[PDB]
Amino acid sequence: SGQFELEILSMQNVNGELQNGNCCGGARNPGDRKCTRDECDTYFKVCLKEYQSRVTAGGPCSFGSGSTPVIGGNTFNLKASRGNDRNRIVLPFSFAWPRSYTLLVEAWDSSNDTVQPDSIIEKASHSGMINPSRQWQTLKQNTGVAHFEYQIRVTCDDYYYGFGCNKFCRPRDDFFGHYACDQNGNKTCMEGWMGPECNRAICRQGCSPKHGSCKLPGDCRCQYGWQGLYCDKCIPHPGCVHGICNEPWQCLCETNWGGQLCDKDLNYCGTHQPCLNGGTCSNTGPDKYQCSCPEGYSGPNCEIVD
Ligand SMILES: *[C@@H]1O[C@H](CO)[C@@H](O)[C@H](O)[C@H]1NC(C)=O
Ligand SMILES: *[C@@H]1O[C@@H](C)[C@@H](O)[C@@H](O)[C@@H]1O
Ligand SMILES: [Ca+2]
Ligand SMILES: [Cl-]
Ligand SMILES: [Cl-]
Ligand SMILES: [Cl-]
Ligand SMILES: [Cl-]
Structure with missing residues (x-):
């Protein structure tokens, strides 16, 4: 001291x-x-x-x-x-x-x-x-x-500051701090670090406060289930096609797509146009439809003539 x-x-x-x-x-x-x-x-x-x-x-x-x-x-x-x-x-x-x-x-x-x-x-x-x-x-x-x-x-004594020689300050660049000492023995943080002992890395500008975090300054590490440059977007359920999410692992289906994985077409008639020879299509459920066949035409798609 x-x-x-x-x-x-x-x-x-x-x-x-x-x-x-x-x-x-x-x-x-x-x-x-x-x-x-x-x-x-x-x-x-x-x-x-x-x-x-x-x-x-x-x-x-x-x-x-x-x-x-x-x-x-x-x-x-x-x-x-x-x-x-x-x-x-x-x-x-x-x-x-x-x-x-x-x-x-x-x-x-x-x-x-x-x-x-x-x-x-x-x-x-x-x-x-x-x-x-x-x-x-x-x-x-x-x-x-x-x-x-x-x-x-x-x-x-070395590294002691103030009127009572009590304020200790020795500079660091390790897991305890990233700082230099100033004339008064106050901790001035290195570029990218913050907090009283300079042990908090400052993240990417725009990184999610709720789903992103740092260990090293500059980066933005996503909480499990979040993704993107700013950890702003959820990851949908694997196997989710024609579906979106609000929260991670969800698979909330787009219009005329049904099912757990939104793999089922609720508007098969519009998507594929199946009835032939002037037949009228009508959607009868997930990946299902029916054909109203004109006279002389038969079958699931009016493909049987005469
Ligand atoms: C800076 O140092 C002075 C005197 O050594 C001390 O009184 C003051 O609280 C310090 N400022 C900060 C922001 O820590
Ligand atoms: C649907 O039904 C068939 C039998 C035809 O009359 C079509 O013109 C109609 O759109
Ligand atoms: Ca003497
Ligand atoms: Cl003298
Ligand atoms: Cl005196
Ligand atoms: Cl130590
Ligand atoms: Cl800190």
């Missing part, structure tokens, strides 16, 4: 005094009060926590804490230097960044090779607001005897 980073820029402790007024090491040469015996072994402690309207010097470091190894003597300047792992403190976070925070930074002196313990040189504290940016914010602690400069920032 994100990272709160702090970089030490410079320290200035001309004499080599701690918070308690004493020197780093031993004796202070009388009169001029110069500390000469030894230089401080300066390291930095950092504590990051929830915003406090009224700052406390003690409390749990909610968002994180860390310390630098000894990075210098009494005085150092790293303001034109690059800044490495020894002079910087990284504090990662997975929660959404609240913007408001409380930061404690302290310069300390190492005393592990002696009988006395590690002691505080100076202590810095502030509460503020900071948004995710690559741009460093410089802070000076100069109120006391010892002064130090540090800079802080909050950056979003």
Whole structure:
């Protein structure tokens, strides 16, 4: 999600005094009060926590804490230097960044090779607001005897967006989405795709909303029983001749066509003209008729003469 980073820029402790007024090491040469015996072994402690309207010097470091190894003597300047792992403190976070925070930074002196313990040189504290940016914010602690400069920032981890580094967005072209990310981490769909995660293919222009569907953009796949470019037309019953459908597998007959498959001619007389030698045809049912034969003509079609 994100990272709160702090970089030490410079320290200035001309004499080599701690918070308690004493020197780093031993004796202070009388009169001029110069500390000469030894230089401080300066390291930095950092504590990051929830915003406090009224700052406390003690409390749990909610968002994180860390310390630098000894990075210098009494005085150092790293303001034109690059800044490495020894002079910087990284504090990662997975929660959404609240913007408001409380930061404690302290310069300390190492005393592990002696009988006395590690002691505080100076202590810095502030509460503020900071948004995710690559741009460093410089802070000076100069109120006391010892002064130090540090800079802080909050950056979003890869694929994280917004003011809290919480909005994840990584681009795709698979069964879960077809999209690119924009500057705000919003999903902009590829050509042919739609929907919140860009997983709906846009069909053929005019494709049936009720009988057509897509898997890939452009196409129009027909529901079973529908057909045509737009899946607009039903498929009639197989074996249906001289028949239409409204719904699939129907076979609703055309005029003068009867039966299950509209194979039977209800107007055989008109279609074939069967009676010969001046006979009169009359339809007597499906593929049936009868002939009224003139005198001297006999048979089903008046074909028997004399
Ligand atoms: C686009 O991104 C902004 C800020 O990152 C967000 O507030 C907004 O809801 C997004 N717009 C859409 C249409 O998703
Ligand atoms: C039908 O009946 C036959 C017998 C003839 O009279 C025809 O002219 C008529 O149309
Ligand atoms: Ca020391
Ligand atoms: Cl403040
Ligand atoms: Cl300084
Ligand atoms: Cl996945
Ligand atoms: Cl979707």
